[PDB]
Design a protein around this ligand. Structure first.
Ligand SMILES: CNC(=O)C[C@@H]1[C@H](O)[C@H](O)[C@@H](CO)N1CCCc1ccc(F)cc1
Length: 663
């Protein structure tokens, strides 16, 4: 298995030993980065002329003049051959040679190579990642890990643009980075170069830019500073802004000025990219002509980014033809997956799919906007790298599995389990969803329908659910203690905790279904209620960000199954034994009687009704009561209003109804 899969491949049945004795040809000529990889693979240090010849170099080098005709005439292309007599590692360019070695490293198994002929090259010119999300920007160590990962998977582009980096966006995009950050960026660029990645530094000046000489000069001054730090590719983002900065004429003029007075004046600047204000069809106003202005005015060499028909969308043939006709060039795709900054309580670990596989020539580039969880994003990144290199043979599920086995080989099956049930985004404003838990979806749907209707569920379906919950617990506990990729485990641990609780709860609820006596049923019932409380605790103490705090897992299929199964069996119990057990499926320390069944939610220091009287579990100082009588007890009482730290336990009087309290 090779990732990305090469364009052309011919395999035999011969097994070549990684030669004890080798003769290196072209070590002084070839890409130093590629040579370093090779020499590292050759600890079989017997290196005389008496050994198996190994030819490495770029097209035009003396080392590979023979195989000149086999080398693909594409940028970043290469030719690789292994047989009994000689090994060839010939790239069309230095980066092509490097990519030949990355494939060669995958072929090396058990210290023995297969007899293969490979002619390979990318179908998309620019492939990689744009760190362009809202939230905590990737740590320095995360970014270093990312760059080495890109090189291994032949991603040649990394676009730096964290929305919450103050020196990337407003107002301090005018200011140079402090010495610490500057030294770190200098290192990143160096590491990027060592891994054949283009470090593209983006700037995001649109929100407060003045279309005058001062701001223009300051932007160029900033670019000049980044250049001194080693940056050789640049970008200007105009996404998510209002006001004068949205002017297409001014944007195009600025970019063209940057191109003509900086990009072309420097001897070695590669990529120049811009992100438009209208970066998807849905936000494009047909009443005007923003995109056709950019397309006509912006110099053709300059790239224009695009997220598809919507903010979050997959790329289609009709969609890319639509934008391309207007910007007068092939779109540079900005794919908003697996970015989760609008569903921050979810991890998006599912496979990469939905993007048309035949449109490689219709795009200038393809980059993915990831989660602020860097390691967790490697699943999607690895897949995009595969897709972008050879879209014609992109295998959705095989690549997803290959990614997981690469990222965490010591616990691949456990990570698959966790990831399969952590891929959907849940409900959101963009209406973007992904498949989740499809393996067990059919058995869950049948079981619940039969159970509710009082019909007999199939034993097979029941046992599948049992197996699933059992597997989830194993996976959760093994992942917690995994020391192979510690940074990964740190990222997902809160979800892994919630994942195990979900599985434990599922087991206990199934036992309530099997329950044949009252005492045992009650024991299980009390255990479930305690587990609910534990999930609440994690939801309130982990991932407490300002936007979607907490931790949600297995939301598409499994949590609804358990909740609905728990509610149903409790109803049956109350009917049978004339009891009044609470069939609530989510713990809530507060109460709200009156909408009669609308549940309360605790988010940070806020108590709210899901879009009348509320009773808190205690007396708190009140902050305010936003909306769209106060009391400490039911005796004495007193589009928004404040509380001024007054003691509150009861409130009395739907798009929002939120009580904020002090902590
Ligand atoms: C190509 N550029 C973008 O995709 C811009 C932004 C950021 O990159 C963000 O990571 C991504 C997905 O959340 N986009 C969300 C945009 C929605 C949004 C909705 C309402 C708003 F008020 C502001 C932003």
């Amino acid at each position: 298995s090779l990732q990305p899969p090469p364009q052309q491949l011919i395999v035999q049945n011969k097994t070549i030993d990684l030669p004890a004795v080798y003769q290196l040809n072209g070590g002084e000529e070839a890409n130093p980065h590629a040579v370093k990889v090779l020499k590292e693979l050759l600890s079989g240090k017997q290196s005389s002329k008496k050994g198996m010849l190994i030819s490495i170099g770029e097209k035009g080098d003396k080392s590979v003049r023979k195989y000149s005709r086999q080398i693909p005439d594409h940028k970043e292309g290469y030719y690789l051959s292994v047989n009994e007599k000689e090994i060839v590692l010939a790239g069309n360019d230095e980066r092509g040679t490097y990519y030949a070695l990355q494939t060669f490293a995958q072929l090396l198994k058990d210290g023995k190579l297969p007899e293969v002929e490979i002619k390979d090259y990318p179908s998309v010119r620019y492939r990689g990642v744009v760190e362009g999300f809202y939230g905590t920007p990737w740590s320095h160590q995360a970014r270093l890990s990312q760059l080495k990962f890109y090189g291994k998977n032949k991603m040649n582009t990394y676009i730096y643009g964290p929305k919450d980096d103050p020196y990337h966006s407003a107002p301090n995009w005018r200011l140079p980075y402090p010495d610490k950050e500057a030294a770190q960026l200098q290192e990143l660029v160096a590491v990027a170069n060592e891994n054949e990645v283009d470090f593209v530094w983006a700037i995001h000046p649109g929100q407060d830019i003045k279309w005058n000489k001062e701001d223009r000069d300051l932007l160029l001054a900033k670019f000049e500073k980044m250049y001194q730090l080693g940056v050789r590719s640049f970008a200007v983002f105009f996404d998510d802004i209002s006001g004068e900065g949205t002017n297409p004429q001014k944007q195009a003029e600025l970019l063209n000025y940057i191109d003509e007075k900086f990009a072309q004046v420097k001897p070695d600047i590669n990529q120049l990219v811009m992100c438009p204000t209208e970066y998807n069809k849905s936000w494009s106003n047909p009443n005007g002509n923003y995109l056709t202005t950019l397309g006509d005015k912006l110099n053709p060499s300059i790239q224009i980014m695009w997220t598809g028909d919507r903010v979050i969308s997959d790329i289609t043939r009709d969609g890319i033809s639509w934008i391309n006709e207007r910007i007068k060039r092939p779109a540079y795709i900005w794919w908003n997956f697996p970015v989760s900054d609008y569903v921050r309580d979810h991890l998006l670990l599912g496979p990469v799919y939905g993007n048309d596989t035949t449109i490689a020539k219709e795009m200038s580039g393809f980059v993915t906007n990831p989660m602020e969880h860097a390691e967790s994003s490697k699943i999607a990144i690895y897949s995009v790298a595969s897709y972008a290199w050879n879209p014609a043979k992109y295998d959705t599920w095989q690549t997803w599995k290959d990614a997981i086995r690469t990222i965490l080989p010591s616990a691949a099956e456990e990570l698959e389990c966790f990831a399969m049930h952590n891929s959907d985004l849940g409900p959101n404003g963009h209406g973007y969803r992904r498949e989740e838990s499809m393996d067990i979806q059919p058995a869950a749907e049948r079981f619940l329908k039969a159970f509710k209707e009082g019909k007999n569920y199939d034993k097979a379906d029941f046992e599948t659910l049992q197996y699933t919950f059992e597997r989830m617990k194993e996976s959760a506990d093994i992942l917690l203690m995994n020391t192979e990729n510690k940074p990964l485990i740190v990222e997902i641990t809160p979800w892994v905790h919630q994942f195990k609780l979900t599985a434990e709860m599922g087991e206990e609820v199934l036992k309530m279904v099997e329950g044949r006596n009252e005492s045992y049923f009650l024991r299980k019932y009390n255990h479930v209620k305690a587990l609910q409380q534990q999930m609440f605790y994690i939801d309130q103490t982990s991932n407490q960000n300002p936007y979607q705090p907490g931790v949600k897992t297995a939301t598409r299929v499994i949590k609804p199954l358990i909740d609905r199964t728990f509610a149903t069996v409790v109803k049956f119990f109350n009917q049978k034994f004339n009891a009044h057990l609470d069939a609530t499926t989510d713990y809530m320390p507060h109460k709200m009687i009156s909408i009669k069944n609308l549940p309360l939610q605790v988010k940070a220091n806020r108590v709210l009704i899901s879009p009348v009287e509320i009773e808190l579990d205690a007396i708190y100082p009140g902050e305010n009561i936003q909306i769209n009588e106060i009391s400490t007890d039911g005796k004495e009482w007193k589009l928004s209003a404040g509380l001024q730290k007054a003691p509150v336990k009861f409130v009395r009087f739907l798009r929002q109804f939120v009580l904020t309290i002090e902590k």
